[model samples]
Target: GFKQDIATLRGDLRTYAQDIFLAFLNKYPDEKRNFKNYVGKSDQELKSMAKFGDHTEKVFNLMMEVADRATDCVPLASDASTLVQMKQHSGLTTGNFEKLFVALVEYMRASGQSFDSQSWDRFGKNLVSALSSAGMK
Candidate 1:
């Protein structure tokens, strides 16, 4: 049950993240274009510009560390009978999700990537829109 719930929650979160990323991409198409160009540039060229070369590696490492810590959370039950049982069995708590979201936002900001309030609000709105479209809670 715990494993099932965690899997379900992880699926939901992945969908949510994808939806948010899509919305972000839609709103800021230039970022995607820039990312392509940025990736194609040589390390020396990037360093010379000091434009695309930022704290990307550090933030990426931090994000991976967080993922490692999160994966350490053990599932409470192997079987579940009811929705409540599933919820109780899973280690995917609301607080954990919130922390993950905040960490992502912080990482983006610390990496010199800018996301305005409007962008975040749009992401949140699009997330709800996606959830409703999927008939999810």
Candidate 2:
């Protein structure tokens, strides 16, 4: 049951991050960087990429605040290092990563931009290619 709850919360955090990323994308559609690459970017880089003047900065901050609030929903454990070890040992597969990639695209569509199906497909392919090249999966 605890594992299920952790999985659910992880999904929710992923969705929340996707929503913030989508909003960032809507205002900056020219950003062609693969979504997976973002995982390696520094916090400063991410903040810079997601920046949108004062108004959207407030929106982005709110999203981060919401995510922080949600983190409290998970109960603390005595030994949580195993979770991180599990993830490190069993890296995500291409298919699962693609699902998260599409989730980001879906959020972009929901943020009022027309869905560029081709772009989404290209992004996914590029992400998988990059990850594979790096021997991630």
Candidate 3:
């Protein structure tokens, strides 16, 4: 029910990331170091790497649900705390947030998948709001 509204880009969500880091890496070529290890890999290799999976899918889905509301979409305490931890230990800055925003949309489009204009825009805005809520600059 919920996914159907995600613009159900396709019948299966996993279908969207089969290309692994193809779009994400290329979209942010210099961002390779952002990960502990995700550089110079073939699509097949990436496909085989379960660690390269969408471990962050939890945040995405939660944020999308928040996006649908268009209110209180800022990171909740748990999300905010998570963001703070990332900020402390990782380079999770506004740049990463922007990169994520662009990568998300581009990846979806590249996969011939997309949320309708309204849903996509709202989702994007909500993600940005979460970053702000985290006081991430």
Q: Model 2 — TM-score against the truth?
A: 0.33
Ranking by lDDT: 3, 2, 1
- Across 1-62, the per-residue lDDT of candidate 3 in tens digits comes to 23454535333435444442456676787877766566777666766667666643444454
**What's each prediction's TM-score?**
0.25, 0.33, 0.65
The better candidate by lDDT, 1 or 3, is 3
For model 2, residues 1-137, the per-residue Cα lDDT tens digits are 32242243355554445455544454444442434445555444655664323333443343233223332222122112222234432655555545544655556456553445454445445545545554555
Note the Cα lDDT for every prediction shown: 0.36, 0.43, 0.54
TM-score of 3: 0.65
Model 1, stretches more than 4 Å misplaced? 1-89, 121-137
lDDT value for candidate 3?
0.54
Q: Model 1, residue 79: displacement in angstroms?
A: 23
Lowest lDDT block of 10, candidate 1? 74-83
Q: Global lDDT for candidate 2?
A: 0.43
Residue 2 error, candidate 1, Å: 33
Question: In terms of TM-score, which candidate is stronger, 2 or 3?
Answer: 3
List the RMSD of every prediction in angstroms. 16.3, 17.2, 4.1
Supply candidate 3's per-residue lDDT for 88.
38
